[PDB]
Structure formats: C-alpha cells, structure tokens
From a paper:
[name]/3 complex is composed of seven protein subunits and nucleates the formation of [name] filament branches on the sides of preexisting “mother” [name] filaments. Elongation of these branched [name] filament networks powers eukaryotic cell and organelle movements. Like [name], [name]/3 complex is an ATPase. ATP hydrolysis and release of the γ-phosphate from [name] and/or [name] regulate the turnover and mechanical stability of branched filament networks.
Our analysis of the filament geometry also reveals minor twisting of the mother filament compared with a helically symmetric [name] filament. To further assess filament twisting, we estimated the excess end-to-end twist, or ‘cumulative net twist difference’ from the average twist of the straight filaments, over the length of the filament. Thus, ADP [name] filaments are more compliant in both bending and twisting than ADP-BeFx filaments.
Author numbering:
A (entry chain K), B (entry chain J), C (entry chain L): 4 to 375
The structure:
Amino acid sequence: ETTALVCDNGSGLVKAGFAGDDAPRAVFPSIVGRPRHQGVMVGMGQKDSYVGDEAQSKRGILTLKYPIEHGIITNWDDMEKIWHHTFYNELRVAPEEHPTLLTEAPLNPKANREKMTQIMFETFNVPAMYVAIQAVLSLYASGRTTGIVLDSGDGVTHNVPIYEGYALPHAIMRLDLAGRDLTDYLMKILTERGYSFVTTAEREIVRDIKEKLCYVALDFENEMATAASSSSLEKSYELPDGQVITIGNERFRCPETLFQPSFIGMESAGIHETTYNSIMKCDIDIRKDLYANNVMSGGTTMYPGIADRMQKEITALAPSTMKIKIIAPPERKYSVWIGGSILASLSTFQQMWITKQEYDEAGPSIVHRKCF
Amino acid sequence: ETTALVCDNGSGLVKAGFAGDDAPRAVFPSIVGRPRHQGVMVGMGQKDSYVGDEAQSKRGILTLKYPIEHGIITNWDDMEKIWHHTFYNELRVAPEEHPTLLTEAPLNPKANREKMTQIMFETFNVPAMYVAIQAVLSLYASGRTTGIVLDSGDGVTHNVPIYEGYALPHAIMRLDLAGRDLTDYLMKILTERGYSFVTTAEREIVRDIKEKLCYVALDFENEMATAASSSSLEKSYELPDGQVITIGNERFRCPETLFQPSFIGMESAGIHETTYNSIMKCDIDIRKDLYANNVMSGGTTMYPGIADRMQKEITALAPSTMKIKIIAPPERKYSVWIGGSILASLSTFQQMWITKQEYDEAGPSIVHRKCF
Amino acid sequence: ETTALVCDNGSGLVKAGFAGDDAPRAVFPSIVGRPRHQGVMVGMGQKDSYVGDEAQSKRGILTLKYPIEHGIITNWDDMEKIWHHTFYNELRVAPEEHPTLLTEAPLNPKANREKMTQIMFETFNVPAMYVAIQAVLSLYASGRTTGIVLDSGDGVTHNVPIYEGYALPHAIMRLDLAGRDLTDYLMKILTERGYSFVTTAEREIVRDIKEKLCYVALDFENEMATAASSSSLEKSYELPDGQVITIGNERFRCPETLFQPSFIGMESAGIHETTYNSIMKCDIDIRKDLYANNVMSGGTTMYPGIADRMQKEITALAPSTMKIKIIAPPERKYSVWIGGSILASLSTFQQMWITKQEYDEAGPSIVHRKCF
Ligand SMILES: Nc1ncnc2c1ncn2[C@@H]1O[C@H](COP(=O)(O)OP(=O)(O)O)[C@@H](O)[C@H]1O
Ligand SMILES: Nc1ncnc2c1ncn2[C@@H]1O[C@H](COP(=O)(O)OP(=O)(O)O)[C@@H](O)[C@H]1O
Ligand SMILES: Nc1ncnc2c1ncn2[C@@H]1O[C@H](COP(=O)(O)OP(=O)(O)O)[C@@H](O)[C@H]1O
Ligand SMILES: [Mg+2]
Ligand SMILES: [Mg+2]
Ligand SMILES: [Mg+2]
C-alpha cells in the first residue's frame, strides 16, 4: 500500500488522517447534534442531524450527544455518522481504497471491538484494518520501547507498562475518570459561585472554561490557603452573549479530581497512586526503567503543572534512591494518533492488518486473534 | 434553650414556627409588594410596602415581587422585610431570645448562605443558627434513616439520596423547574383558550387555578385522547369579581411539564428520569433500598395522581426484579419545616448550632465549616 | 481447660469457636470498613468503623479493608478490631478466661507470629495460646497422620507433606495465589463482557458471582471450544439493584488460574505441578503414601470439578504404576478449624500451650521455640 488511514475514534474528539503524516489531517468533536425546536422557516436548507464542527457551531438550537462514553461506543447509529462524516467530509477519501488503523482503550468490552470491525468491512468496505491500544501507539510517538504510559482522554484514563517492547497486560490499570468527569465536576462547583450550566450546549462552554483557565496546583492545601487571600489566583472569562464570569479555587480544585477521585464521590486511587500501583504490579527488574520513562498522553494531561504534580507524587510513593522522570511532550494532545501514523507506516506492520479476505471467512471474531 | 425558632425561608411561600410543634405556626406568601397607583384619599392609612397576607390582600393596587428566584435570594432589601415580619408580626417574638434553624436547596451559591448567616447575627442578633438542606429535613419528618427525597417547592426541584444517614453529594440532582414555572406555563396555555393573565396579581389568580384544579395524568397520550371526547375532564372556575372561565386539557398538560420539561423549552431530564439517574449514580448495594424509600416533599408534589405517575415511570426505567415504592405522605406540604422542628428539638443537635460567639470571630464564612 | 477457643484468623473469612465443637461457632468476613461519605442524619447509631457482617451489610457506604493480605497481617489496628469483635461481639466470651489456639500459613514472616503472640497476651490477656500450621490442622480434621495437604484460602495456597506425623519442611510449598486473586481476575475478565466492578463493595459482588457460578473445567481447551458453540455453559446472576449479568467462558477461565497462574501474569507451577513438585522433594519411600492421601482444604478448593481436575493432572505427572487418590471432604471449607478444635481438645496437647507465665519471662520470641 502507498497510504493507509489512521483514525483515533476517541471520546469527545476524533483525530483522523493518513499514515506517514506528522499530525492529524482532521480534528473535530466526537459529537452528533439533533434539533430540539420547531423548523418555522420554509425553503431553508434544514438538516436533520449535525456532526463535529457543524454541531459545535449551531449548538444553541441542538441537543448534543457524544456516541462514545468512557471509551465504549454507546450509540452505533450516530457513531456511523461520525465515521461517515470523517471519511467523506474532511478526509474526503473513498474508504474502499485505504486500509484503516482504528484505536481503542485497554480492558474494553469485546463487543465494542467486534461491531467496530464489522462496520469497517460491511458498511465502509475497507481493504483491511487493525485495532491498536492507545497507550501502545503512544510509545511510537515518543520513540521508545520501554515506558509506562499514562493516557487520559475525554472518557477514560489508563496506565500501560511496556518493557523492551513487551506489554505486561496483568499490570494495566483503567480508570473511568477523564476530561468529561472533570467538566461535569466543573459545572457542579461553578454552581456554588452562582453560575448555571446544565444544557448539553452549556457543557461545551464549561469545557472551554476548563481548557482555558484550569491548572494542577503543586500542593493543594497550600493553594487553597493562597486562594483565600483572594484575587491573587482569580481569572475572568467571557461567555457567549458577552456576560463575564470570574473563577477562583475552582480553577485548580477541578483538575485535582484526578489526584483525589473522592471529589466526584468514587472510591479509587488517584492517577499518581494508579501509576505507582501499575509499576508495582510489574516485575522488580523493570520498575527502575518504568519510573524513568513515565510517558503522558491525551488531552487531560495538558493542564499546566500536571507533570510537576505527578513527579512530586510518584517521588513520594517510590523509594528515594532513583530518578522518577515524567515525559510530557508538547504534542501529547495527539501522540496516540501520531504513534498510529508511525505504526500504520512501518514496513514490518503491513503483514499484521486484518484483510477483507480474512474477515469474510472468520467473522468479527477475527479481531481477538489478530490484535492485542 | 427552652425553644428554638425554625423557618423554611421558602421560594413562593415561607413556613415558620418553633421546635417541638407538629406543624408550622405561620405559613404565608414569600412576597413583598409596592403600590402602582395614586394614593388619592386624604387621611388614609397610607403605607409604602406590604408583605405576605397583607400584600396578597391588597394585590389590586400593588405590584408583587418574590425576593427568592430558583431557591436563591435575589432581593435582600425585601427578604429582610420577610424575616422581620416573620419574627415580629405572626410569630411575635424577639429574635435575640431564640436560635433560628434555616433552610436551603443543595448546590446553592455560597454567597446566599453567607449573607443569610450575616443577616441573622447582625440584623436580627440571634443567639445561634444553622442552615439545613430541605431534603435532609424531609427524612426526619418521614421517620427514615434512608431514602431518596424528591423535594419540589415553588422555585426548585431536587433529589438527595441518603443511606444509613449518610448523603451521597455526587448523586444529588437539581432542577430549575417547580411551581413558579408551572404557573407561568399555565398563564401561557390559558392564553391559548383566549383568557389573559399578565400582571403579578393575575399570576396569583392562575396559581389558585393550578392549586385548585390541576392534576397529573397516569398516561398523557390517553388523557389527550380522552380530552377529544371533550367536556369529560374539563372544569369551571370563578375569578375575583365573579366572572367564570372553563379549563380544558391544560388542567393536566400543565403538571406534565415536570415529566416533559421541553414543554417550557429547557433541555433536561423529567422528574422521573432525574430521580432514576440520582439512584443510578449511587453505589450499587444502596439502590435497592432507595427504590423502596422514594420520598416526596414540597407543594409541587401535591397534585392528584403524581405518586401513581412517578411509580409507573420509575417502574418502567428500573429493572422489574424489585419493588419501587413512593412515599407521598399527606403532610408533604410542610414536611421540610416539620423535619426542621424535629432536628431543632434533638438533644444531640444543640452542639451543632453556629453560636454568635463562634460567628463574630470568623465572619459569615463560618457556615461552610459547620453546615453541609 | 473445660474449653479452649480456637480461632482460624484467615484472610477475608475468620472462623472462630470452642475446642470440642463440631463446626465454627462464628464465621464472618475478616473485613473492617469505614464510611466514605458525609453523615447528615444525627440522633442515630452513627459509628466510625464496622467489622465482619456489619461492614459487609452496610458496604454500599463503606470502603472495605482486609487487614490480612496473602496470610500476613498488614494492619494491626484493624486486626485488633477483628479479634475484639470475634471475642466480645459473637463468641461473647471474656478472653482472660480461655486459652486460644491461633493459626498461620507456613513460610510466613516471623514478626507476624511474634506480634500476634504479643497482642494475645498484652491486649486480650489470654491465659495461654498456640500458633498451629493450617495444613497440619487439615490432617487432624481428616483423621489421618500421613498425607500431603493442598490448603487454599483467600490469601495463600500451600502444600505441607506429612508422613507418620512428621512434617518435611524442605518440601513445603507456598503460592501467593488463592481466592482473592481469582476474585480480582474475575473483575478483570467480567470487564471484557461489559461489566465494571471496581469499588471494594463491588469486589464482594464479584466474590459472590465467583462462589455461586464458577467451576473448574476437566479439560480447559475442550471447555473453551464448548463455550464457543455458545449458550450451553452460560449462567446468569442478579446483582444488588436487580440488573442481571450473564457469564460464559469467564465462569471456568477464572478458576483455571490455579492451574495456569500466567493468566494473572505470575510465573509459577499450577496447584497440580506445585503439589507434584512437593511430593518429588520428599524422600522416595514416602511418595506412594502421599499420592494415596492428597488432602484438600480451604474455600478455594470448593469449586465443582477441582477434585476431578486435580486428580487428572497429578495422575499425568506421576508414574502410571501407582494410584493417586484425592481426599476432598464436603466439610473441607472448615477443615482447618475442625482440626484445630481436635488439637486444642487432645489431652496430649495441654502441655504445649504457651502460658502467660512462660511468655512474660521470654517475650514474644517464645512462639519460635514452643510452636512449629
Ligand atoms: N489545554 C487543555 N486543558 C485541559 N483540558 C484539555 C486541553 N485540551 C484538551 N483538553 C481535554 O481533553 C479531552 C479529550 O482529549 P483527547 O486526549 O483527544 O481525548 P480522547 O482521546 O478521549 O478524544 C477533552 O475533554 C478536552 O476538554
Ligand atoms: N394543592 C396544590 N396543588 C398544586 N400546587 C400546590 C398546591 N399547594 C401548594 N402548591 C404549590 O407548592 C409551591 C410551594 O410549596 P412548598 O412546598 O411550600 O415550596 P417551598 O418549600 O419552596 O416554599 C407553590 O408554588 C404552590 O403553588
Ligand atoms: N463454594 C465456593 N466456591 C468457590 N469459592 C469459594 C466457595 N466458598 C468460599 N470460597 C472462597 O474461599 C475463600 C476463603 O475461604 P477460606 O478457606 O475461609 O479462606 P481463609 O482461610 O483465607 O479465610 C474466599 O475468597 C471465598 O471466595
Ligand atoms: Mg484518547
Ligand atoms: Mg421546600
Ligand atoms: Mg485458610
């Protein structure tokens, strides 16, 4: 083949393009939007459903659904609209000509991967495809064969240890807390300063407040004290319609949910303890190299101060005699897709695709014997 | 102390009285009103503002302002008249004599609770006070350590799950739709039958139409079909001055907004879906006992048929494997205040009051470190 | 004494009672749990810690901690709550009056036995005590003085060869895989069918799924092929909250971790290989009588088909010239406690107790010269 696609069919935001390009060709919301009002205009070019940037643009008149929840596809009829849009609108390919690398979280339901395999061969007729783990792809972008990858998206956070190119699948950790739960918690805490955000259109406004204003405080109790000497840490922000809102300790109490999942009431260890537990499930000789190669990936790792905070916290859990080093590159917003564009381009990978001629004799069950 | 005051400082309607009474000593409109017409009579007892039953009585000559919107005090200069009137006129006690229990919605703005705290210690000089969640009080009145309380007053509808007396604040739900929004919708749909209601006093006339004649259908499409065999479900009502109006399917299409908020153009779950979502956000082992102890509170839960409609709808959402039971007691019009009268009476509660001596060294910020 | 106590302080299930009784007087979860939510009701039995069935019953609002991990007590402040509950709450004895037989896995830390001795004399003031090896007690319940015992609890699996009443301590094997690791692996593989169990309360739901439905395949590859021609091996389970989960090959792929520890990623012999390797470490003349007396003990030996599988596999490793018999009694769930109740009742054992008079001139290091 001369060109494959790589599609990072993620929660909240899809990244899409071709193998061997250095960054995604297309990046848009993993959203389908549907009207919630009467179509009172006549001769208007009214469309029954909107997807990606069209839905994000028109959202005052729409109800917005993400067809992926926690890295699991929950609405296949609208997920087919996202893949149809992806290929025919801004990639503008013929899917029958290009083999597609697809992307998934570890410890997902098998039925997700099977129906995703079925749609690619039976609805899009692709030549071939493969499903790769987001955290395995994240080491190709880094240029490594050992590291522990913390990947944190819109839906799921997960840790995957790799040493000398072998995964330790028994030491993988998954966590149903990422960019959506932080946005919902930001909506909840913004209520107590007097602002209301509740519609699926207002959750997108609060996602922009989260992306623009929020950060990870290197010591939470000292930052909560600092914010009581107020206006020192406060930022103003301008809503659609031009009303201004101001934010204080909620600017960093929001991202702290990653380190203290008890803020959203769940009983699980923080992302620091989860990375440390994942290294401690690994065999003793590999732990020293995993601590030094603690890779970060995905948009929920983009906060200011989060690499510093997690270096402070893994260094408090690990023994003091060795170098915890956290590798947070500036393109980590796309390092899954970038690593998929490398893998789909490798000359040795071209024998590993599931081909149409191998699917159609074995059914969607083929994807469990041929993929990790 | 020998007695304590207790107030549900309600949206639309205040309830007030003393600890250990089995019902409120006073219940009256949460209203202040000012003249909108000339005082032409010389030697008249002319007065520049009115409150409660006095404003409700003079409402031909007044414009009526509710100083509480959606459970938030939006007009302190008139809310201070409501609290002043409450203590000095129909409770007729000196506020410095008795500590006050006070009442709030969950997820409210912190500035509301702070300013309420300040006014009680600095305008009314009370010995001590506390602020309690309307739904936590409703389990004291119902005699339970566990339940999910749907509370629906004039201004707000909210759900609080409680199990073994511990609340789950991650699973709390709040909804800016209750008795006011149903009254505004009733003005709009009575206008489809040609009746005009637009002044604030006409909203009180339409509120009496709602309170006297409205009800919840067990199945809306069957009731809308039944109303096409007309004059069966329809009723007649007598206005002030003695004119009469006849009320059609708007008699049950009004309360159905609680189950279909899209009738008033907002994009949110109905009260059945939001109570189910609140149970489904809880820890799995507690859900069986929340379905069995679903408690109704506040005047917007007083419609005929609402318990039967909600038992039907929650039974359709929940798995059939277990017994949904909705506890709608007849005193649920006052169950918040009744629960406060129990809480203020308990010997083990008297250490939980914020005392004047504990406020004046910490300011109104004391309330967030002693209330829920 | 007229009665001693015997307390099999095992991982995650404590079995306790009097010497001379035929079964444990008390059996309960070896668990302590603490609230993880705000207590909003007051005038109530609010309690800062729950233990045993109180923790297991209220688990929907608790984080649950096991104070024993792999047969090692890791949290003594909660193990003292388990013994205090054992003695005062449902044995309802005064410990000062009764000598107590305690119990431990072989190849444990010496400090675990020392601190366990210290607490019994300095916190509970017992007249005397002893620490027995759980596999030596499994021969006492079995009514034989030669055999090899596969004991497998919640924390640890171990083999102890005994011939003519002498143990062969060079031939003891210990494996840090038993009922907890199988439960945790079932949480992992249930995720691949779409069910997330993640809290320490949901781990108890998965432990009940494991106990009710899981079984050991006689031939794993034949059973996997049988489950691929599906629906014949599937069963379903009703959760708390009344949602139903169906379970298929994960019903027997879970217990196969005992025969293939590489499923949880650990490098070791399976329980068949570890038992055979233990017989091979023994002196050649005893091996015939060890194969003829392969005793099984503890709850992780309770799966349907495990005796048939374990006999099938030892019979393939051992030479065909002689007969393997596996002795898996129907009471084997309590055979350590039953055998401890026999040992503590023997007239020949009453010289072997460590007495308070013999502890308080030697310190807790007495337990290394007087016990096993
Ligand atoms: N600069 C930023 N600060 C904070 N959050 C961000 C930033 N950029 C993106 N995000 C968040 O990252 C989440 C998804 O990013 P991504 O890694 O693409 O996840 P996914 O792989 O699930 O699509 C979104 O919820 C978005 O709000
Ligand atoms: N019989 C009734 N039918 C319908 N609505 C009622 C009835 N009685 C009271 N209400 C409504 O209940 C609302 C407030 O009741 P209440 O429970 O006191 O709320 P709050 O606690 O907010 O004061 C008012 O808007 C009123 O219209
Ligand atoms: N019928 C059963 N089938 C499978 N596992 C069981 C059964 N009964 C008990 N267990 C398991 O046995 C384990 C502990 O049993 P036990 O022998 O008391 O161990 P311990 O001595 O460590 O307390 C628990 O993890 C439980 O899940
Ligand atoms: Mg991602
Ligand atoms: Mg109320
Ligand atoms: Mg045991």
